Amino acid sequence: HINLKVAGQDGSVVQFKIKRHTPLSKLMKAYCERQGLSMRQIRFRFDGQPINETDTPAQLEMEDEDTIDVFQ
Amino acid sequence: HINLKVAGQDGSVVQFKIKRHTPLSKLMKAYCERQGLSMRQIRFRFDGQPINETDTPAQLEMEDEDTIDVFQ
Amino acid sequence: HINLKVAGQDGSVVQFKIKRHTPLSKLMKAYCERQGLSMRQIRFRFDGQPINETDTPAQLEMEDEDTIDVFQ
């Protein structure tokens, strides 16, 4: 697994672990469930690029302790 | 204190700090309270072994930044 | 940004990132919102000193991976 941070605009940082070839939608759904948020209302980006349903950490060239940004 | 991670099957990783000779039930109860979960429905394991009410990090040979796995 | 930990008496550790010259009330409000807590009922301290509305990490001489303590 690699460890990823999900950072909100409020400064909150929530941690996940995910395998490099697993879709990031695993993480996005878990974030929403754990944080009581809706995909209808939030968006996830990595180094400015939107993350799609099937993108994986390896495809997006993510490394351990990288950060995903969440926006409204 | 040592720092411990509690990892769910969804990839969520939640952090605790606990003294080495304090029972892990402190951590288990705090996890349940903070995550809105019930002991009735979840179980905690460390390197495949169930964690009991009075087990301590020192007894289970846990070290800083180790991970506890949570299951349904 | 620097990374800060917010530690509860239950051993929970929640992470934030904040710029050094931004008021810590950003973090305090985010903690309360994310944790479903009220400022009416909790207090934040750093190395024994209460944190006020306009105190910044730089003013309080905080560094990456320092811990803020939360109390009832």
From Swiss-Prot, chains A, B, C:
GO terms for biological process: positive regulation of proteasomal ubiquitin-dependent protein catabolic process; positive regulation of transcription by RNA polymerase II; protein sumoylation. There is a cross-link at residue 5 (Glycyl lysine isopeptide (Lys-Gly) (interchain with G-Cter in SUMO2)). One of its GO terms (cellular component) is PML body. Broadly expressed. Keywords: Acetylation, Host-virus interaction, Isopeptide bond, Nucleus, Ubl conjugation, Ubl conjugation pathway. Polymeric SUMO2 chains undergo 'Lys-6'-, 'Lys-11'-, 'Lys-48'- and 'Lys-63'-linked polyubiquitination by RNF4. Cleavage of precursor form by SENP1 or SENP2 is necessary for function. Transmembrane segments: none annotated. Residues 1-72 form the Ubiquitin-like domain. The keyword Plastid does not apply. It is found in: Nucleus; Nucleus, PML body. GO terms for molecular function: protein tag activity; RNA binding; SUMO transferase activity; ubiquitin protein ligase binding; ubiquitin-like protein ligase binding. Disulfide bonds: none annotated. Signal peptide: none annotated. Belongs to the ubiquitin family. SUMO subfamily. Ubiquitin-like protein that can be covalently attached to proteins as a monomer or as a lysine-linked polymer. Covalent attachment via an isopeptide bond to its substrates requires prior activation by the E1 complex SAE1-SAE2 and linkage to the E2 enzyme UBE2I, and can be promoted by an E3 ligase such as PIAS1-4, RANBP2, CBX4 or ZNF451. This post-translational modification on lysine residues of proteins plays a crucial role in a number of cellular processes such as nuclear transport, DNA replication and repair, mitosis and signal transduction. This is Small ubiquitin-related modifier 2. It comes from Homo sapiens. The gene is SUMO2. The chain holds residues 17 to 88 of 95 of the full protein.
